[PDB]
């Protein structure tokens, strides 16, 4: 990992933000060399990302480099599409929508340059309609370029070019899975399918699709434009790259910054800009993932670098790429229930473990917080959480327990004493 | 809230502005043919827009356009959130309350 | 005609013996010497059922709202 950073220069993977929002020639960075890329054999791009080997921003492992050079090697009778989440499911994510808001010109390229690797046919994106204003403008960004003849059907210089069809959702979590999105792109109700039909690259719209994420297809052109040997810059021999973090919930100026891997949380939280709560003596009870990781106390987290597998060393890792912390007044038990009260409303409801199994917790979590009937429950409530893992289809269950699974870990007494606080009270 | 209708506007009636029948040419244009059969997500919502909340005769209408048995619509409008089945106001306001927002 | 219990003769009327197989089934009708009849065992077709054929390009089997 080198020098234990993760610095930020003007040399980064994102071109500009406050400079130019509208259309043009991509005055400096973008749309630079194209006809040379596409005219060379497609699999040249395939595995040429391996110089980086992006883990992927979809909240998981499984480097993006494999799945595209993965099946969808051949082609037979039926077209292939691209479905790239723009959605945000996790509370406090916020990383998305900043990419789109002030610089859309990147991703329409990101597909066209990207889609050629798939050998795909069309391009769908998807956006939660809950963003009405910013998402409305992409069409202009599509038009303001696409109208110039930059895309389709040969554009430019190849015999292969195809346009991008925006769509919208409503009350979606649906980006909560692939093999759901490709279902509610269709117009059924969205109940995500079983994971191994034929996994997500066989059963699809009518025909094989691949579900990418935003900065997985956003940073691909610039990492195939230059690459290197700088493609692997920071992070150890395992995880490599520089992703975006967006700090939220206590800071001086919670705001995004581009930061490379293996950055410790004690300098990163304090920096960009201040630590404005107590940098210490505010107890710094932290959540690595947005909703997908339980607490860490004042322990090795602060020296624990943000590298992925570095976090699996602790009791939980995070792929979500977000930060929420706390200081003093926020009662964690009080502040984790409204993370659970959230889950109960976003779940499909097919499976018997998820449905009727999350409420069993959510109905009891309003006992502990309020303070109420006796311990030895905690010992059970742990087993429930241990009882939903292989039992649910999607990850929302595997992402349902961890907050409670990792609350019972790391804080014993805060509960034990409160059940007394109402016990002595009853007396 | 309850998800059954007490026969409010079975015949409201309702209809689309003839300015809107020229866009639905473009929406279906998106998809491939023969699977079309659901554009329902924009088309059902565009109807909310023309009105501002969609009564039960709005749910029955698009079926006559899209030829799907109109329990393959009443379903989709009771799953998502953004659609408002009951009437609303001029401003429908949201307060984000979640772990960070808390 | 006192209560409505349905009283009866036909003193067998309730016996079910249980054999293990046909070859040894008829074995006990002859050996005790009364008339009889036979039915046949039934088991289903093989059969062919595959999930994941339910989402189809040109096929006519394509389910909605499952």
């Amino acid at each position: 990992f080198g020098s234990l950073k993760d610095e930020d220069r003007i040399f980064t993977n994102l071109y500009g933000r406050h400079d130019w929002r509208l259309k043009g020639a991509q005055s400096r960075g973008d749309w630079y060399k194209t006809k040379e890329i596409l005219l060379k054999g497609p699999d040249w791009i395939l595995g040429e990302v391996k110089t980086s080997g992006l883990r992927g921003r979809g909240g998981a492992g499984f480097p993006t480099g494999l799945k595209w050079s993965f099946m969808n090697k051949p082609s037979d009778g039926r077209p292939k599409y691209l479905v790239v989440n723009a959605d945000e499911g996790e509370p406090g994510t916020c990383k998305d929508r900043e990419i789109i808001r002030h610089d859309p010109h990147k991703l329409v390229e990101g597909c066209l340059v990207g889609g050629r690797a798939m050998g795909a046919r069309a391009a769908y994106i998807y956006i939660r309609g809950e963003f009405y204003n910013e998402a409305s403008n992409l069409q202009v960004a599509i038009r303001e370029a696409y109208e110039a003849g930059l895309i389709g059907k040969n554009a430019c210089g190849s015999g292969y070019d195809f346009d991008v069809f925006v769509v919208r959702g409503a009350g979606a979590y649906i980006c909560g899975e692939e093999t759901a999105l490709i279902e509610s792109i269709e117009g059924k109700q969205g109940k995500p399918r079983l994971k191994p039909p034929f996994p997500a690259d066989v059963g699809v719209f009518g025909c094989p699709t691949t579900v990418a994420n935003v900065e997985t297809v956003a940073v691909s052109p610039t990492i195939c434009r230059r690459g290197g040997a700088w493609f692997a810059s920071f992070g150890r021999e395992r995880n490599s790259g520089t992703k975006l973090f967006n700090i939220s919930g206590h800071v001086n100026n919670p705001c995004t910054v581009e930061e490379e891997m293996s950055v410790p949380l004690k300098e990163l939280i304090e920096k960009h800009a201040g630590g404005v709560t107590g940098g210490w003596d505010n107890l710094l009870a932290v959540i690595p993932g947005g909703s997908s990781t339980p607490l860490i106390p004042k322990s090795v987290c602060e020296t624990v670098l943000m590298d992925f597998d570095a976090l699996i060393q602790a009791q939980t890792g995070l792929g979500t790429a977000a930060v929420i912390v706390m200081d003093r007044s926020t009662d964690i038990v009080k502040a984790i229930a409204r993370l659970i009260e959230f889950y109960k409303h976003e779940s499909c409801g097919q499976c018997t473990p998820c449905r009727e199994g999350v409420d069993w917790m959510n109905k009891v979590m309003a006992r502990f917080v309020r303070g109420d009937a006796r311990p030895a429950e905690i010992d059970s409530l742990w087993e429930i959480s241990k009882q939903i893992e292989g039992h649910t289809i999607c990850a929302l269950g595997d992402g349902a327990a961890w907050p409670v699974q990792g609350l019972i870990r790391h804080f014993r007494p805060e509960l034990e004493e409160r059940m007394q606080q109402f016990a002595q009270q009853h007396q | 809230v309850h998800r059954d209708t007490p026969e409010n506007n079975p015949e409201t009636p309702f209809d689309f502005t003839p300015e809107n029948y020229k866009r639905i040419e473009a929406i279906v244009k998106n998809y491939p043919e023969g699977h079309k059969a659901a554009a329902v997500l924009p088309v059902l919502d565009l109807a909310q827009r023309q009105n501002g909340w969609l009564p039960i005769s709005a749910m029955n209408k698009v079926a006559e356009i899209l030829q799907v048995p109109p329990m393959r619509v009443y379903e989709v409008a009771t799953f998502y959130t953004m659609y408002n089945r009951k009437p609303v106001g001029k401003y429908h306001i949201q307060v984000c309350t979640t772990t960070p927002c808390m | 005609p006192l209560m409505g219990w349905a009283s009866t003769a036909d003193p067998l009327s309730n016996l079910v013996l249980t054999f293990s197989t046909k070859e040894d089934a008829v074995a006990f009708a002859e050996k005790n010497g009364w008339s009889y009849d036979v039915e046949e065992r039934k088991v289903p077709k093989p059969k062919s059922k595959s999930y994941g054929a339910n989402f189809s390009w040109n096929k006519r089997t394509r389910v909605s709202t499952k």
Partner: peptide, 28 residues
């Protein structure tokens, strides 16, 4: 900013410039 009026957005440049579609059939 335009609360209603998705029209020309959907029906002006998109309507003419979304070719063909072929899209096939699927009769069914």
């Amino acid at each position: 900013y335009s609360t209603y009026t998705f029209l020309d957005l959907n029906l002006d440049l998109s309507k003419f410039r979304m070719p063909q579609p072929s899209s096939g059939r699927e009769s069914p």
